[PDB]
Curated annotation (Swiss-Prot), chain A:
Compartmental location: Golgi apparatus
Note: Present with 432 molecules/cell in log phase SD medium.
Function text: Specific subunit of the TRAPP II complex, a highly conserved vesicle tethering complex that functions in the late Golgi as a guanine nucleotide exchange factor (GEF) for the Golgi YPT1 GTPase. TRS130 plays a role in the YPT GEF activity of TRAPP II in concert with the two other TRAPP II-specific subunits TRS65 and TRS120. Required for both the cytoplasm-to-vacuole targeting (Cvt) pathway and starvation-induced autophagy through its role in ATG8 and ATG9 trafficking.
Signal peptide: none
Protein name as it appears in the record: Trafficking protein particle complex II-specific subunit 130
Subunit structure: Part of the multisubunit TRAPP (transport protein particle) II complex composed of BET3, BET5, TRS20, TRS23, TRS31, TRS33, TRS65, TRS120 and TRS130. Interacts with YPT31 and YPT32.
Family: Belongs to the TMEM1 family.
UniProtKB/Swiss-Prot annotation, chain B:
Biological role: Specific subunit of the TRAPP II complex, a highly conserved vesicle tethering complex that functions in the late Golgi as a guanine nucleotide exchanger (GEF) for the Golgi YPT1 GTPase. TRS120 plays a role in the YPT GEF activity of TRAPP II in concert with the two other TRAPP II-specific subunits TRS65 and TRS130.
Disulfide bonds: none
Source organism (scientific name): Saccharomyces cerevisiae (strain ATCC 204508 / S288c)
Location in the cell: Golgi apparatus, cis-Golgi network
Oligomer and partners: Part of the multisubunit TRAPP (transport protein particle) II complex composed of BET3, BET5, TRS20, TRS23, TRS31, TRS33, TRS65, TRS120 and TRS130. Interacts directly with TRS65.
Family: Belongs to the TRS120 family.
Protein name per Swiss-Prot or TrEMBL: Trafficking protein particle complex II-specific subunit 120
Residues shown, of full length: 1173 to 1289 of 1289
Additional notes on this entry: Present with 259 molecules/cell in log phase SD medium.
Amino acid sequence: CKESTKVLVKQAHNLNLGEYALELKSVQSDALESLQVEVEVQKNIGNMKNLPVSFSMDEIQARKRYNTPFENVRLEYYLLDQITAFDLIIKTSFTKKNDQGTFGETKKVRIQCYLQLSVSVEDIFKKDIFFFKFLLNSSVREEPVILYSS
Amino acid sequence: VQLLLDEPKVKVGEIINLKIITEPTSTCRRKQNSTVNFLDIVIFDSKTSKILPRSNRRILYNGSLTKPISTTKVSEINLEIIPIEKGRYEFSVCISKSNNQDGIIQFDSENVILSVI
């Protein structure tokens, strides 16, 4: 037993590139919270997990508040629900297992996915002509949003 | 500053690019610090009493009007004055250097008027 309770450097390995791994993110979704994993591998990568590593399960599933681990799924959309929070956690594990080596990982990501571009409307209505006027606002305070089509 | 416009005599349901043209000066040599300088565009009724940012049923536009210029060269700018149910408007600018209050340093007097039938 090393008995190193303190007084050292602890951990000495790096998550470098040029290796088959997993990457979970979120983009391009219309007002209903989701996620999107990505698998940049080759030659029959195996199944993977997607746990719900929360304290009280605010990042809920639809009917039963499940984790629903995938199987040979690279990109999907975990259409969750929202039981009253603005922060989460997600322990994600993936048995890679390329060739004669049971390759695994466990990344405990912390994605929080409240909306940003909070948009309100107003119409005006004249005789046989019609106009909307759209209000555009950022749901967070003093973190800015650039915007380049509408 | 000059103000280059398409027409002064537009009907109601029509879209107009407005084009201000600004000329930074030799006597910008006092500062050089904020190369970016924030203007505004304010719309007056050609009686008194300018319309608010929420120009409801009067004039319509694309984006916030603040629309920065350089202290470098002849920058241009634009809006899209989608007119609605009006007559005899007025456009003029001011220069604000910053975003805060009491940042405003000059008020130009170039007042191009247009009519709406």
